[PDB]
Structures are given as structure tokens and as C-alpha cells.
């Protein structure tokens, strides 16, 4: 018998082939704005939190599930129209 104790390992992970190209400065990017847009966010969310995600496509997706519930975000009331 031989061998540590006091914990191990807790972790896994694996990124093959992950490469795009990124964008700073200069008005947000489109290119990903469209992404978010198509799936189903609005272009300002979307936009302001792709700055905040340095213009990320796949971040910006969980920026907009965490900030799903944000004040700041700033969102209009939801009256009969467009149920």
C-alpha cells in the first residue's frame, strides 16, 4: 500500500483546435453581434455585454444568462403587445 491522502485531483478539461480572432476598440464587432442576435437576444444586450466580453460570442451567451435577471441591463415592461 502506498499512497497520498490528503486529496487527489477534481478537475477536467480539453480545448482541440480553438482559434478565431478577436476584436478591440472600435465599434462593437457585427460579425458576433449577428451570432448573439440569431440566436435570441436583443442587439443592445447583446452589444453591451459583448463589450463587456471583449466582444465574445460564446462569454457574451452566459454575460446575457447571468445578466438575463440585471437591472442595469435595462429592460421595458411586457404589456398586451408582442405576448
Known sequence: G???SSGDAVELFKKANA????????????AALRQLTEMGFPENRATKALQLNHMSVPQAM???????????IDTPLSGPSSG
Do not use: F, K, Q
Not at 482559434?19 to 457585427?30: A, K, P
Not at 452566459?62 to 442595469?72: C, G, N, V
Open 62 to 72: 452566459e454575460w446575457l444568462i447571468e445578466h438575463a435577471e440585471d437591472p442595469t
Open 2 to 4: 502506498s499512497s497520498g
Open 19 to 30: 482559434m478565431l480572432d478577436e476584436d478591440e476598440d472600435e465599434r462593437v464587432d457585427e
